[PDB]
Amino acid sequence: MPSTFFNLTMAFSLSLLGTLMFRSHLMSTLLCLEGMVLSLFIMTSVTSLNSNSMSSMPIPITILVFAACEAAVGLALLVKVSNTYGTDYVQNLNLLQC
Amino acid sequence: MNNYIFVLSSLFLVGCLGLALKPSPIYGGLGLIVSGFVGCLMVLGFGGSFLGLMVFLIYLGGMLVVFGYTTAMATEEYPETWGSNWLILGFLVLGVIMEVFLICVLNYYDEVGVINLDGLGDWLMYEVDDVGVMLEGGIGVAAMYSCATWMMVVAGWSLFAGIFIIIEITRD
Amino acid sequence: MWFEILPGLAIMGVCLVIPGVSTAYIHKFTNGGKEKRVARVQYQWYLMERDRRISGVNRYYVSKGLENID
Amino acid sequence: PGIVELPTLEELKVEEVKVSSAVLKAAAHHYGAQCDKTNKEFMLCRWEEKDPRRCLKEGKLVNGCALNFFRQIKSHCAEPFTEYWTCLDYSNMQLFRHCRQQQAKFDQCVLDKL
Amino acid sequence: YPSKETAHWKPPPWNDVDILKEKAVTNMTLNFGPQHPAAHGVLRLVLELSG
Amino acid sequence: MFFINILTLLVPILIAMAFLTLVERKILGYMQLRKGPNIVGPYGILQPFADAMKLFMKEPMRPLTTSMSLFIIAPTLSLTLALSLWVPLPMPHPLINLNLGILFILATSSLSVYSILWSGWASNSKYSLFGALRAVAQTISYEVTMAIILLSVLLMNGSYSLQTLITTQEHMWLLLPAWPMAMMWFISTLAETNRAPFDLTEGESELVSGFNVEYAAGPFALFFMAEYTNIILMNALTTIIFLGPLYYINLPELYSTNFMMEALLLSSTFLWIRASYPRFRYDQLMHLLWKNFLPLTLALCMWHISLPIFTAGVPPYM
Amino acid sequence: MNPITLAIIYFTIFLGPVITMSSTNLMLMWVGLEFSLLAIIPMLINKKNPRSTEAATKYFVTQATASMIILLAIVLNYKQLGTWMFQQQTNGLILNMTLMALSMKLGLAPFHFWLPEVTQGIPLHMGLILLTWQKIAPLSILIQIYPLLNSTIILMLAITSIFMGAWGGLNQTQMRKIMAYSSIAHMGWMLAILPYNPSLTLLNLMIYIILTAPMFMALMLNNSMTINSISLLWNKTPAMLTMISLMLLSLGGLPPLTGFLPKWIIITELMKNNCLIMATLMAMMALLNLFFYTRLIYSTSLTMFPTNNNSKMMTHQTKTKPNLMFSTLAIMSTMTLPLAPQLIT
Amino acid sequence: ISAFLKNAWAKEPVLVVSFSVWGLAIIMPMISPYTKYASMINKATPYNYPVPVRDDGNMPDVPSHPQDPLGPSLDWLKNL
Amino acid sequence: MNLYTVIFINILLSLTLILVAFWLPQMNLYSEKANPYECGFDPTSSARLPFSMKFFLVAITFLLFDLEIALLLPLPWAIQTIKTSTMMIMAFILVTILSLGLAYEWTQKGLEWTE
Amino acid sequence: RMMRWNQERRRLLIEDLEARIALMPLFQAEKDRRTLQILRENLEEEAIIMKDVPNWKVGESVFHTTRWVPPLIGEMYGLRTKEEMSNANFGFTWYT
Amino acid sequence: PFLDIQKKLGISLDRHFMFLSAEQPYKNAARCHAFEKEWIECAHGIGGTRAKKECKIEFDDFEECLLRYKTMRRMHDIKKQREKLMKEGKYTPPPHHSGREEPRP
């Protein structure tokens, strides 16, 4: 249990590190976000099964629901970005410097 | 045995690391599928199956859509892999080595409440009801319909609104 | 004519029958002339472990009746 | 800080049943009406005290009553009960709906002789 | 206030609409033949695709 | 003993895939006024072995534009899953009794698509990519209705286990109460396999071979046998869920026999359909599954949610 | 945009923070935050221009990261002490990462680099929402756990927000970024006092809201987005210069205007806890905040920049705006200090 | 309107059936006399142990034995 | 353990087949053979360029529908509950809201492909 | 037909569960007695070991309450072998 | 809490399943149920400032039931000493600790 939770926390931290340290592509950052969601879902399910608290299992499924909605709107924004610039690069949305 | 769940968690960690290194979203979705498979395995190893199969199906659909999208928006002439860039491969190997170091030095200097290589496999399923009939995980997730009705309307409205919202965003 | 097709159909039918009969006969041969006990809930698994223990050899299908209560 | 007391290996010794599960499932519906008193005393004593150490002699009495039940069986109606639980051990789940012709012989036997 | 960094900076548009470099179409070109069964054997049919 | 059971479940499935290719060819021939293989062996019972041996004797291709890792992984995974979907099947006794067997099936099937996706992407050819995107569309189309059909059926079974359907159908098929759901499930299994009229992933008339166009003898054989195995698998699923073989605990052999008869019928029907119809356009598949099957599927899901209640016919939990 | 879509989206925006406020469980606070940031985006990108798309991206990514961090905090506080809502017996690391993520969302410094841009790229009625209605739910969270927040971190964050807001809005020509930096500074104030007294951060929030909403209304009257544009008000809507000047001087924190009340009653409650230095610096830099409001007053009302030959047309025509709420709020945002005892407690 | 329903039943019968089944699913529970029995059955199942109570001597309505004629009978479910 | 056994057996079967397919036959490799296939002629470009997607909205919608399926799947258990009216009502509301979202998409022409 | 069959199945479930009810007391007694036996064995051996280490109390609890805290798998099956331990964890998840 | 609407209308949307000691499906019980119950009952009516000092014993018993750091330390020390003994040949596990046991019942 403790080693499992330590490793899942380290994994969340790695995915957060990826999300913070951008590269050219945006979808990679969206995927890192989904990986954080995965880590958290797994941690919550493991905790609820270790505690035998079957009243908290409805929580991780909601986590997944909202994470996937976030992913959907992210993909839509990605579509718009590609339509505008032809690519999902981040170095192109730098005109709001004024 | 006894090293089973730890190996699962380590594979999940490596998958998430190779994901965070941000190769072409193709291999990133691959790593995410693998990490979801490992998460399913570990959730099953802790007692619950419904949640594991669920998350697996969900992320499979998601990575299907993500493949469809990256082949249209997030592609390149020469897509990058973990091996393509010497620097990325080096930091990947470095991360594996650093995980090894952290584990082997915490076992030594730290207490056993985090990582106990000696004593592994002893703390997975602390307590259980040996005479039990109604312990499946789906009972909790079905509580949504009877007891936790609030989470259900919340999620359903999230999805409704999401439909309307994605339509409005994609309007040209 | 159309009856020149029955050879392949019969071959594939035999090949599709073999798995189930094999599984059943093997389960009987390995679980003491009985159907492999199903553990859908923890109660059945508890029963099976009880049987395993009380049986002189650790095997759940060695049923011990009234010969073992006096 | 404080010590935790535990009975001694002899304080918790009984005449165990050592009888399988299909047999218990066969005899349960009759073992419920004939040992309800002691079974329920033990189990109430269990939920009320929440300690498996305070409620032990009741469990020994439970074992004794079960042994007496199965002896009343083994004396009068060993063979019908044998047929019943042998038929009932075959299923992968030990179902009753597969051994109804033997259940009736067992129940008639007991209705008559006990 | 001007700096060596904010020299190239241009005042934004009055309607938040930016004259943008017209990114030309990239239409996938495909040799539908020959050797393609639909193509009756000697047709090449170079065509452009958006999807 | 368990390894011997693995063999008795695996090698017959592959022999059946081979002779299914045979029966496919011969049935389509006789429908097309021709014979089909009769030369290689007596009535052609050696053509599959000839094909397979010849393929595994050919030079495979390691192109210059391909991602060899995925190019090689994809067929491995295809075949692996095609063979793994057969383990939890009760005939009438399964090799692996899973409570959530239906979900195992669903997930493994939804995973078998990534073989096609990664193959078509790795190959790095335009027709391969087209086949991959068509597979994406096909899955996005059918996967929504699959699970809801299956849930609506299971709401009278009481669980996701494949062995409670046997006691559920102990008296009467599940086709009578669910023949609409059975029809939709039949067509959706027809799509899950990339089988006509939904042979769009390898549509020879638009895409020379789709995701196979760069693949060669051995890996191609793996793909092909995975397809022709999943065919039998989905037929077995239809005939365990909606059609019910006779289960008498003292006679599982009759159960296996009738299961096989019905599976043969459904597979021959797949071949019949390949022979009888043209091919869809992969947008029309989406329109179908999202405008005729999904609305009706939701209506029937609600109907079968209510039916156990205003009938007091809620199933049991074990 | 059709009325059904508008209904769903605005109802969702409204509902989001309500769930957060009215909920005991942290997970439902999280889903409320998510409703908010999922429904607000289409209202940003509605105009469908590159600036709107990139504003939407910069907003979505930031808020999603912050939400994932808050979710990690909740999940750790669940793994520990087996409950959902926080308690006195909870790890300070958890509490402080939660505070950091809530700041990230709110847009406090040094987590502010995204708010000026996201506000410059979108229309004004959304900047209003963004800066007023979307800063509540986070503040609700912070007000339910104020006894547990570290004072060092919030105070560093607050002085940083003050300094950066001042220095940033000091050299801005676009008005939307000026309002963004004003939000940053006033949120620094709101947060500097939260652990000591959260009944005062709510006061400062109410006042900042009733102050910025009519400013945004003024800007929306002539769709004014620059200093040079508002310089033309003396020819287009000279009846607005008085209220504009008063609201600006109040935002800056000048007596006898009720924008000085938050500053004053926060400095007081801070020195009741011996925070002399923090309050001192905060005030001395709120002065700098006032400076550019004063330069703007110059540009708009206290002198008359050149106009154009075409504004004569706008003079010819009539106008239906503003509504009744502008005058109400602009009066209750400058001429209500005499009622301070009623406002403070 | 009948002509509209008719031309829809001819052209787009799938949506007609969908709405009809939707309405019937929503209605029939309000109609049947066997609806009350669902919860009664799901309540009759002893998924847990029937923890007994202490005989304070003031429980006349409560039985001393399973086969004591007192408590809820399941005849309504034995002949249904 | 048996599931692991069977699945690994299948892995090994597939890998053996691939090994004996890559090492048994005689090979003769050269560039004109290993080059991509575009119907007899040379590709005009790489297949790694943006291949526009015309059903992106339908895929996004498929995500949310998959989640609604995930929420519908616990019914086999939710029907074993005493509070049956609540389960009935919630399931009906869920399916109805799902259908209404689908209908709005349909009408606003989301299920139709960009051309 | 499905209505009728599912009703009879519910009745059969009642029957099976009533049998389980009739048997649960015996199983509870046996389980409690067996857990106490295992714990006493582990106590005797913890006393043999830890005999000379300084400042060690054999049966000392990690709790300040004196009520019975039901032990957990690690304790019950800690001194025993590794197979007897893995069975308690993965025995039922890794089916019969 | 910030807007106690529930406590006003007298409903429960999110508060009946917060902690482990709440009503679970089919009257099961999450582990550490009694410890959590006692902690909550001690912390009732006095505030979180007092509870951090007066329900400290109970909260610590809860923390130990749930996380079990001390049982872990204890069993680890026992195994370590036993390994030392076996290493230097001063111990032999009894039969019931080496598989060979009397498997009651």
Ligand SMILES: CS(=O)(=O)C1CCN(c2cccc(Cn3cc(-c4nc(-c5ccc(OC(F)(F)F)cc5)no4)ccc3=O)c2)CC1
């Ligand atoms: C005008 S039409 O309507 O008539 C039109 C209808 C379709 N049609 C048709 C149908 C089925 C098969 C084929 C021949 N064919 C075979 C293979 C292929 N087969 C095996 C294989 C592996 C292991 C096997 O078992 C064992 F070896 F034992 F392991 C057995 C086989 N690998 O690859 C691949 C491609 C291919 O075209 C042709 C005829 C023509």
